[PDB]
């Protein structure tokens, strides 16, 4: 749509637009400046171990690893937007890189008696974003700077994957989530386009295996988790367990995610406001909305982008944004009510993202 | 059945649910508190992270009670649905894994007690590891933790067989029926997985705590037994009672079917006209759940053990209401839990088959 | 007694009637169940070096040692009233010696700089409690688990007293108090009594002693303390030092006592309400109750109980009891008002108090 | 002339201290709260106790500023009164000293940059430190720091000569126009002081920050410069471009003249029928005083270095009175502080002679 | 003589403790509050504990000061009361004990100035435990701490008679005069117990500090001296004044009685019709009690010393009604103390004999 809704900072047609201008909107240049102004306490101020950002917007130690993974896929569309801030992107990406290796965003691991090693085995969830963040900088820089270390971590995901009974890498021992592992996937094919390697043969095998008892294939939608050692699947369903992981395969294999999309709808979004709004349910026989972590409506807003469904994000924006209360004060953009953990982070993800499959073909700097 | 005001389920969904082959909508939204979001739920890991105790404010020395309840609830519901028992083996896997973690035992070392909390005493502790190492093996037919379940039973059979009284102290000289009854339907558990035979230490048990640790007219036992000095405490006990009456209930029926009646008339307050009940903690009180506050709630799983669906059908009026359910996203919450142990207790109370059938779980399907 | 005065739990007669009955009163009987009855909260719940009673009651880190010992004293005297409850006053006895060794009990001595081993010299105030404590243990129960440590003990009082040029043992270094010595006087009594040794004999000494600078023979009264490398004597006399140094003399010196006590009353006993209360002034020079340490009145009540002074008893209990607010919830007492330091110690204490001159004869088990 | 509303004395009074040869008693007032009470004073001892800053609250990260900024007036106020020449040798002691403390430094450890604050990078520090050095030494003409001096210039020269940029990084891969204006500036200090010729760096300095750095036609400098990526940040910065003018027109005049009525264009936002002004931080916003909030107060600074009294009258009206002064017992205290460093940068402000008449102190 | 409102005793009955050979029943109320309560008592144990200043919120630099005021009283009221002398010797000796603690000394470790109080500098700390070694001496006739006075008395000559200028620093380069006439005062003590001649430095600090250290006009010492520089802070202190005159009175009477009409012309305000008095803390200032806020309690201790009893009079009215003494148990408690050091500077006005006196004070 072309007119602006309430409580709206710029318009869907807008958001889609970007690309086709090469400009990025006057609230997601405030997004940057938030994330790269003020002295010290901006979150892409420093390579260093200092998480002053992340204390001042509470948010909790086993969440920052993804704050800056949704940070850094951001970024990446943002140096397909706006050739002018391809330098700038790198430079935060960089900075991603850096601060993902500091032991604050991976201290739970050991903190939990797993291991003291966080990328030795298992614990996708924190090294599946690591790899692919580390070849998102050098699609959008051309650096080699990371290249020893995302050749390493490559090759242990590949070999893990290769060793493993079930198609894919366990988070915790014993704990095998769907969406951890489409990032670790997605990873392979972006060091195969920079390496003209085949690291993404092994993505047919874990389509397979996912389809089997870990997706509900009439409802569209993904079980909790599958856990090996008893072969136990959660028996619930999950709505941003399945935007997020059809959001990524769309990136691979785009008609898997095409098949299931209009079913993940049917089952979870909810259309209110006299068609004007949208928000998800987390799970099955339940009427509320934004359950669990409360990710659902969020994770739909990157699927709906993803998915080129403009509808759906206007509804879903509507519902999400007015409430947080934006403000931009000195062109900087802050929310005084932030709905949920990682809400400026998905927020500006969705409003800048051009696609995992064309981040994937980004042509070089 | 009528639903009674503030009640999630009537008495007779929650009896029906094993001949159903279905748990209540209410007990499968405890399950998806207990599984169900990312890092804070109790059995998300394996890990020694505690989040979902630090929300609950559990006192560090409850922990292990109530990872053990939570084992004997999941080791019913594997019972009842067997749609739902890997997920019931899975989060006995994780339910063994955290009770083994130093945050749950610390206190053994703190108090000043000893290094190791399996060595020798502290029943408390290794009484529930067993009974959940067995539980784990019936459910799962997994043999993960056999090498430590074979370890424990022997370290628990070698220490009643050099002890003068029938039994295990928990702290130093600190001897409790309800913390034994655990141990001795640890030896049970092992006995039907491995053909042995370290229940018959049992007889000479229930010989012992019938002499000076039970008022038999009353059916009541008293706080505890010191063996240094011989001493028993002089008050008697109705959460202490409860929980032994329950558990024995599955070792020798007769015991337990003896003692309930008179157990009821020395502690249940039956009121608001028939519908609701609540348990006075000791003798020459009017009040009730004083001391530890678990009287009810201990007496809700001796109902539910028992078959006694009318004192199950006034506990849980008396306990459920006042704590507010809800169900949010299909997931189960209380607004004002009014004990220690309370979802734990609740969800136990709702789903047990029975100590006794427990034992006698047939295996898994392949 | 007869009658129940307003507020009061149960009769002076009734207190006082306790031995002969062979009973404790319901609420002597309450007080036992707070003792005992909670897992791992109640103070004699076990014997390791756990403190949470007290942290609970917020018992000051210098003030534990006399809880447990004036709650040791209450029980001595259960063991006289009810047979019935002997092996269960023995088993707190137990509890009571084993908490009392604890650091958290004597470790004041080594923060403030004075040694790390608390029973080698000086420091009566900690060593005399424990010593009169390993005495009524064995007393009660007959045991001889502590009778090495109590033998080892004694003799270190005794020496120590033997190479002193003033009769008795410091506290702190240079500091020298009636009451603490009193203690270690009576543990010698104790000790000899199981024995038949005569360490005791060094109490003549210690009474000729303290008739000279340290009372004034006028006011039947204590000074507050002595400090021999001065030769100082404080100047100003002490009810609660007196209260408890005349009781704990009249089970060694009943004559003695006797002698000082109605010049003591005159001196410190403010009686109020038409004779139905009574309480007790700190020092000369003031109308004021219960000033300084705050536990005159308190220590007056076992005094009165010591002398048999039913009249005296009733009008302290009524002063001290009433508005400290008494319930017993699930048969164990709880003050919503405790008064002072000590408090449910002291009640309980004085409330049973055989008389330490009987519990000196405690017939054997 | 006339004292305006909430002001303590007039702009002709602080413009005029010099000529006169003495401070203005707030001024006076100011060097009281600084040096009076025992233990809490901010110059009461050499040792590493920073009880005035906890008692004002200053982050970690701000103390090092906050030191030099006290210390760039106390060179001023050593110019203004020969009387006070003594105390603000004195003062500028304790200073260095102060600011050698791990209190004021550990920032650099802490964030996992390296064990020694002043080996590598890290110039928003040791800048500061080696204009302190200098300034010490021209007020007092004690050599008590001159070995460290000798060594801290060299390791910045050697530092700038070897960077393929002109001049040093803070953070690794964090350039900053205004933290290399101080190093540059502790040049021009060594210079005078031993006849070196360290300052000669300055000119490619000058034409590599005029290149990407600056939008010439709004005279304003970029946040910061990346050199990995070569990346600049794309806003504007007023308080980075009021503090580089500031001290870069003590070593090139003509540099910052040309771009401050520019400055002024862009940021500066009269207001009250001419009597206030305050700074908008950055472009496209009406806001002022945005990101670190010192736009304002550093532009004060600009506005005396420059000899504006028009402006400095109007962002002092803006900044003072609102921020509540009082002086009890002779010694200045502001109840309503609008910014961190607010009663150092008033204070360098009030007093400052301008950074080319630093260079040029004659000795005692 | 007449009672004023919320006094406890009259100025008369103050003064006439020592020929009535007896302590006000206020100031026994004091010395039960010292003595009295187990374990929380200020003097109650030799032990390092410190709860007594605990509870008064007495911060960790302050709590030296407070036990030598504390035994400065203690030494007065040994020559008031032959009766309470073996109290008093009591009391100093756990003075001396206390003041060893590491808890009252730590803050020189911690600012980083050393490991051992009392080797070199720190005469702030080592003065006053240098008097407290003699006063206990004099009070006791024990030599339960002569070894340790011997070595300190040396110590405190030594570094005297190696300083270019009259006297010893507190922290390194901070020179104050009230911190020296203890270290001074603690000189003629040890020669009044032992024949020596370590008091013949006086004369020369006595010089010393009546060139830049005074404003010979107004009766008032400059705050503080900083060798290194040579600076002396411009603004004159009455609470330095008012110490420093009422020791130096012991010494040289003349020295006192010369400046102390300029000094109350310079800092003392009269008010309420001449019944009270206020003591302004610096000049050009109508403000009393700024700074340490101590300026009216030690100008009560200057006024005793100088038998001043109309000022004496007019100081306590101003300073111990608003405080709201009250005696519980026959124990002195203030609801409102004015000022840090309260109870101690009062305690000491009420009993203080003249440091003449005490210097003279006969053996037991």
Same mark, same amino acid.
């Given at each position: 749509?072309?007119?602006?809704?309430?409580?709206?900072?710029?318009?869907?047609?807008?958001?889609?637009?970007?690309?086709?201008?090469?400009?990025?909107?006057?609230?997601?240049?405030?997004?940057?400046?938030?994330?790269? %102004?003020?002295?010290?306490?901006?979150?892409?101020?420093?390579?260093?171990?200092?998480?002053?950002?992340?204390?001042?917007?509470?948010?909790?130690?086993?969440?920052?690893?993804?704050?800056?993974?949704?940070?850094?896929?951001?970024?990446?569309?943002?140096?397909?937007?706006?050739?002018?801030?391809?330098?700038?992107?790198? =430079?935060?990406?960089?900075?991603?890189?850096?601060?993902?290796?500091?032991?604050?965003?991976?201290?739970?691991?050991?903190?939990?008696?797993?291991?003291?090693?966080?990328?030795?085995?298992?614990?996708?969830? %924190?090294?599946?974003?690591?790899?692919?963040?580390?070849?998102?900088?050098?699609?959008?820089?051309?650096? @080699?700077?990371?290249?020893?270390?995302?050749?390493?971590?490559? @090759?242990?995901?590949?070999?893990?994957?290769?060793?493993?009974?079930?198609?894919?890498?366990?988070?915790?021992?014993?704990?095998?989530?769907?969406?951890?592992?489409?990032?670790?996937?997605?990873?392979?094919?972006?060091?195969?386009?920079?390496?003209?390697?085949?690291?993404?043969?092994?993505? @047919?095998?874990?389509?397979?295996?996912?389809?089997?008892?870990?997706?509900?294939?009439?409802?569209?939608?993904?079980?909790?988790?599958? =856990?090996?050692?008893?072969?136990?699947?959660?028996?619930?369903?999950?709505?941003?367990?399945?935007?997020?992981?059809?959001?990524?395969?769309?990136?691979?294999?785009?008609?898997?995610?095409?098949?299931?999309?209009?079913?993940?709808?049917?089952?979870?979004?909810?259309?209110?406001?006299?068609?004007?709004?949208?928000?998800? @349910?987390?799970?099955?026989?339940?009427?509320?909305?934004?359950?669990?972590?409360?990710?659902?409506?969020?994770?739909?807003?990157?699927?709906?982008?993803?998915?080129?469904?403009?509808?759906?994000?206007?509804?879903?924006?509507?519902?999400?944004?007015?409430?947080?209360?934006?403000?931009?004060?000195?062109?900087?953009?802050? %929310?005084?009510?932030?709905?949920?953990?990682?809400?400026?982070?998905?927020?500006?993800?969705?409003?800048?993202?051009?696609?995992?499959?064309?981040?994937?073909?980004?042509?070089?700097?």
């Amino acid at each position: 749509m072309a007119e602006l809704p309430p409580g709206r900072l710029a318009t869907t047609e807008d958001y889609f637009a970007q690309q086709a201008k090469q400009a990025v909107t006057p609230d997601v240049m405030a997004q940057l400046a938030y994330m790269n %102004y003020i002295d010290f306490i901006s979150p892409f101020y420093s390579r260093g171990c200092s998480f002053e950002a992340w204390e001042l917007k509470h948010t909790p130690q086993r969440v920052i690893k993804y704050s800056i993974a949704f940070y850094a896929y951001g970024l990446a569309s943002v140096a397909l937007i706006d050739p002018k801030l391809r330098a700038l992107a790198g =430079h935060d990406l960089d900075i991603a890189v850096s601060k993902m290796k500091c032991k604050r965003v991976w201290t739970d691991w050991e903190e939990d008696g797993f291991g003291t090693d966080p990328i030795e085995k298992e614990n996708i969830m %924190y090294k599946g974003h690591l790899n692919l963040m580390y070849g998102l900088y050098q699609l959008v820089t051309g650096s @080699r700077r990371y290249e020893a270390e995302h050749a390493h971590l490559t @090759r242990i995901i590949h070999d893990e994957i290769a060793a493993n009974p079930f198609a894919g890498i366990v988070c915790e021992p014993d704990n095998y989530f769907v969406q951890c592992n489409s990032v670790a996937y997605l990873s392979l094919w972006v060091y195969d386009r920079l390496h003209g390697t085949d690291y993404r043969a092994a993505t @047919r095998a874990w389509l397979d295996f996912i389809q089997k008892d870990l997706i509900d294939p009439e409802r569209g939608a993904f079980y909790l988790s599958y =856990h090996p050692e008893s072969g136990a699947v959660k028996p619930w369903i999950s709505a941003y367990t399945t935007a997020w992981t059809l959001a990524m395969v769309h990136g691979m294999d785009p008609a898997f995610s095409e098949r299931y999309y209009p079913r993940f709808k049917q089952t979870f979004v909810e259309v209110y406001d006299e068609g004007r709004k949208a928000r998800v @349910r987390e799970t099955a026989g339940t009427d509320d909305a934004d359950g669990g972590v409360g990710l659902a409506s969020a994770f739909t807003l990157l699927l709906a982008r993803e998915m080129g469904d403009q509808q759906l994000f206007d509804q879903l924006l509507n519902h999400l944004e007015p409430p947080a209360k934006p403000s931009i004060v000195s062109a900087s953009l802050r %929310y005084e009510h932030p709905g949920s953990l990682l809400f400026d982070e998905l927020l500006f993800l969705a409003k800048v993202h051009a696609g995992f499959g064309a981040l994937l073909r980004m042509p070089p700097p």
